[PDB]
Amino acid sequence: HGVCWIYYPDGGSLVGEVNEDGEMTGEKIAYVYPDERTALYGKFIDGEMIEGKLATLMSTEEGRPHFELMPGNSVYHFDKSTSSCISTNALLPDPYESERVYVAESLISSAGEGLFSKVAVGPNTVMSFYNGVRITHQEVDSRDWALNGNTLSLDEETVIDVPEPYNHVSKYCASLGHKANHSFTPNCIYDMFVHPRFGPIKCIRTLRAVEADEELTVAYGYDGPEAPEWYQVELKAFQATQQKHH
Numbered sequence: 161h162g163v164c165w166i167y168y169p170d171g172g173s174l175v176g177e178v179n180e181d182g183e184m185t186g187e188k189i190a191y192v193y194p195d196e197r198t199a200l201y202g203k204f205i206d207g208e209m210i211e212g213k214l215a216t217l218m219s220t221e222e223g224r225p226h227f228e229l230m231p232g233n234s235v236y237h238f239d240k241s242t243s244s245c246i247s248t249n250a251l252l253p254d255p256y257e258s259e260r261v262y263v264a265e266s267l268i269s270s271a272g273e274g275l276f277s278k279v280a281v282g283p284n285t286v287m288s289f290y291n292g293v294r295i296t297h298q299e300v301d302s303r304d305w306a307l308n309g310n311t312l313s314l315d316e317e318t319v320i321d322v323p324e325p326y327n328h329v330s331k332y333c334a335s336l337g338h339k340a341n342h343s344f345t346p347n348c349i350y351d352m353f354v355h356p357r358f359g360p361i362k363c364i365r366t367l368r369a370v371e372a373d374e375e376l377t378v379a380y381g382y383d384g385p386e387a388p389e390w391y392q393v394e395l396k397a398f399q400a401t402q403q404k405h406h
């Protein structure tokens with residue numbers, strides 16, 4: 161039988177035999193993460209994940225994938241956030257992210273928590289997901305700017321936010337992208353990502369080879385005019401230490 165592999169620009173894919181309407185509908189469909197090994201296998205309807213069981217892509221034979229279910233009954237489903245509901249299982253971690261990153265005290269003085277690599281990876285590796293509630297740019301701009309620590313732009317219309325109390329891992333740990341701190345010498349970037357559980361979000365992708373236990377950092381997008389005070393102070397301190405030609 162025929163099998164269709166739909167790769168997203170981020171490297172992840174949807175794989176399965178399509179139905180008679182050319183739809184990704186059935187009991188043996190899978191979402192495969194960018195490592196081409198970690199998979200969520202099971203029931204999908206028109207490419208939407210209804211029941212995706214944690215599995216490993218063991219091999220492929222002429223485009224036909226062979227999956228092995230992972231023990232532990234880790235199950236996922238499409239659960240795209242709204243402006244107020246971040247997730248319906250806030251404490252169920254993403255399996256791909258769980259094996260790549262962890263949260264610990266930041267190496268940046270007084271910067272709270274940070275995001276760290278659990279493993280050695282090459283450049284251009286998806287490490288973490290930036291999921292959150294979906295709000296407009298106008299809502300972010302119009303509201304009290306002190307509520308905008310975790311507001312990451314998705315596109316010209318939408319912002320992804322991780323508001324209180326979900327910015328604490330004890331209340332929300334389905335994704336951990338909101339834990340990466342700012343640096344003017346970052347080792348990661350935010351990039352688009354099409355997630356089977358979270359829907360259209362952003363991810364943290366390495367810019368270079370990263371070693372295990374390095375802090376993962378991204379250059380934040382300000383402008384700068386009305387940037388947070390910690391950013392303005394860091395900009396001046398960073399500039400003062402840059403070596404110059406005499």
Ligand SMILES: N#Cc1cccc(C[C@@H](NS(=O)(=O)c2ccc3c(c2)CCNC3)C(=O)N2CCCC2)c1
Binds near residue numbers: 300312382
């Ligand atoms: N302008 C602005 C602005 C407002 C809030 C936050 C930010 C920084 C934010 N920059 S952003 O995603 O390009 C962004 C977010 C919100 C808004 C903008 C840009 C444009 C103005 N509308 C609101 C960022 O890089 N973050 C990294 C971790 C979380 C936030 C910029």
Ligand SMILES: C[S@@+](CC[C@H](N)C(=O)[O-])C[C@H]1O[C@@H](n2cnc3c(N)ncnc32)[C@H](O)[C@@H]1O
Binds near residue numbers: 266339340341394
């Ligand atoms: C997206 S959160 C990153 C994780 C946050 N540190 C935490 O503990 O949950 C953004 C917040 O982290 C802090 N932060 C990020 N980068 C920083 C830096 N380079 N120096 C100081 N504080 C920083 C600021 O409080 C900012 O509002």
